[PDB]
Amino acid sequence: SSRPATARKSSGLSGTVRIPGDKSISHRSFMFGGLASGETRITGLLEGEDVINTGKAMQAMGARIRKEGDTWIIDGVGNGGLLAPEAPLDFGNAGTGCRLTMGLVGVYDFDSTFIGDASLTKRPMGRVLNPLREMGVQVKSEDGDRLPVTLRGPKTPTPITYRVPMASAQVKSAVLLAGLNTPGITTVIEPIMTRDHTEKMLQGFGANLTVETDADGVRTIRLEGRGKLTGQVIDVPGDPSSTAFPLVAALLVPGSDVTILNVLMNPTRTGLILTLQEMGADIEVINPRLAGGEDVADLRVRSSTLKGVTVPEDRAPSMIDEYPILAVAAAFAEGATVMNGLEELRVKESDRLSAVANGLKLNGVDCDEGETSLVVRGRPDGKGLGNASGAAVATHLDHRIAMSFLVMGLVSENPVTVDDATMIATSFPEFMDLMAGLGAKIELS
Numbered sequence: 001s002s003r004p005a006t007a008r009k010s011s012g013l014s015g016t017v018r019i020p021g022d023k024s025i026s027h028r029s030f031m032f033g034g035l036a037s038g039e040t041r042i043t044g045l046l047e048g049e050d051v052i053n054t055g056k057a058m059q060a061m062g063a064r065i066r067k068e069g070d071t072w073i074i075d076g077v078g079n080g081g082l083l084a085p086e087a088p089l090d091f092g093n094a095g096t097g098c099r100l101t102m103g104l105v106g107v108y109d110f111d112s113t114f115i116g117d118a119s120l121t122k123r124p125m126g127r128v129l130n131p132l133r134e135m136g137v138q139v140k141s142e143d144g145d146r147l148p149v150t151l152r153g154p155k156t157p158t159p160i161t162y163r164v165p166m167a168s169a170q171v172k173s174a175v176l177l178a179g180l181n182t183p184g185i186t187t188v189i190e191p192i193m194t195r196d197h198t199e200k201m202l203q204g205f206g207a208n209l210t211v212e213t214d215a216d217g218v219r220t221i222r223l224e225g226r227g228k229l230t231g232q233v234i235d236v237p238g239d240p241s242s243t244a245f246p247l248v249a250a251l252l253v254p255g256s257d258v259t260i261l262n263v264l265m266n267p268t269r270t271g272l273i274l275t276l277q278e279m280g281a282d283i284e285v286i287n288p289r290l291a292g293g294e295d296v297a298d299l300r301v302r303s304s305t306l307k308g309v310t311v312p313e314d315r316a317p318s319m320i321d322e323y324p325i326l327a328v329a330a331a332f333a334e335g336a337t338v339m340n341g342l343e344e345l346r347v348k349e350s351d352r353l354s355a356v357a358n359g360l361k362l363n364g365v366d367c368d369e370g371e372t373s374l375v376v377r378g379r380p381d382g383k384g385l386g387n388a389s390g391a392a393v394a395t396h397l398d399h400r401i402a403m404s405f406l407v408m409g410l411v412s413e414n415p416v417t418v419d420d421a422t423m424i425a426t427s428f429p430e431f432m433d434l435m436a437g438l439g440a441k442i443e444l445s
């Protein structure tokens with residue numbers, strides 16, 4: 001079952017906190033550490049349920065994973081060394097773990113079955129299964145290419161040149177991981193850049209992987225298959241998607257001054273910050289530095305008055321997971337915020353466009369949901385927003401919908417209630433404690 005939570009209007013949020021590790025990089029740390037030759041040591045790993053599930057899947061295939069002190073230590077099997085899993089690989093709510101692992105293991109000559117929760121089971125896998133079919137993988141899936149899915153790789157996979165049809169880092173990632181156990185050169189062409197953790201990390205593990213960007217922005221990513229991968233020391237940066245919740249809360253709640261430490265600033269992950277700045281947000285980037293091979297900085301955020309803006313379709317890939325929290329910020333901005341190019345939101349943990357639109361309307365916000373867009377008109381003072389009757393926002397098992405609306409309740413005249421807070425631990429188990437520490441009033445059922 002589920003457990004509702006209600007956020008109440010708060011006086012200023014104040015403090016300095018370290019945000020939990022980046023989920024995208026954490027998944028990949030377990031995957032590459034488990035596949036590589038030798039030992040991989042990870043500090044700052046996100047210990048949310050999603051990442052733990054990826055770790056269990058890697059253990060099921062031969063990697064030894066353990067936590068010594070604050071460091072995760074992995075003994076990898078070496079590229080080409082994955083062992084046939086005894087049972088289905090359960091990815092729970094994690095699209096990333098599921099999609100990437102399908103590419104990783106689908107090209108091995110043994111059966112692998114993939115299962116997950118009610119949310120993951122409704123999401124499209126065709127975007128990853130199609131290129132795998134081209135590579136020679138045999139696929140048994142449910143209608144619409146949905147889980148459960150059983151894969152059986154060929155004795156010798158076929159390397160392909162695949163142009164990713166939508167701006168998905170997961171599809172790009174799955175094809176590159178499939179390429180690791182495929183002889184020849186696997187090439188992924190990305191017309192619009194998506195988060196590049198797979199490319200950067202594989203290069204760090206020693207893969208012969210190159211990225212060439214045409215002057216028009218198109219990326220050609222080449223990977224030589226069946227090459228050695230060497231265990232690495234990894235230092236995981238703070239999650240910029242998780243940072244978005246206390247960051248927007250500090251912008252919206254009057255009398256606020258919050259500093260978030262060690263935040264990943266890779267530009268494929270900072271579209272929300274750029275957008276909020278255009279809206280008038282007071283976000284100071286402090287001590288930008290290089291840590292664990294990634295750009296990081298600390299962010300000092302103070303209460304700001306915001307004005308609606310137009311958010312272009314080409315900025316979407318760089319903030320795709322932050323549209324829910326951006327929609328909440330827009331509900332308190334002067335004027336209209338217009339966001340298009342949102343088709344991808346409909347296939348996430350929940351259809352995020354529909355879930356955000358319904359939640360906003362339930363909480364008195366004037367907005368228009370289009371097939372691939374959202375327009376939100378705000379009420380800066382928060383009057384008439386929220387839900388006095390205590391009606392709950394339907395989260396549809398999507399932890400980002402739950403966190404976004406809980407942030408809204410810290411600002412609206414009336415409290416905001418979400419029907420379930422249990423999925424927040426999939427990527428941000430520290431959420432309740434972290435927000436409470438800053439002064440937020442959130443009551444869990």
Ligand SMILES: O=C(O)C1=C[C@@H](OP(=O)(O)O)[C@@H](O)[C@H](O[C@@](OP(=O)(O)O)(C(=O)O)C(F)F)C1
Binds near residue numbers: 096344349
């Ligand atoms: O490769 C990655 O690490 C991710 C790539 C993106 O998906 P696409 O390739 O489909 O654009 C994100 O939207 C996804 O984040 C979510 O990732 P999960 O499904 O839960 O794993 C999220 O955290 O909200 C989202 F997809 F739901 C994580």
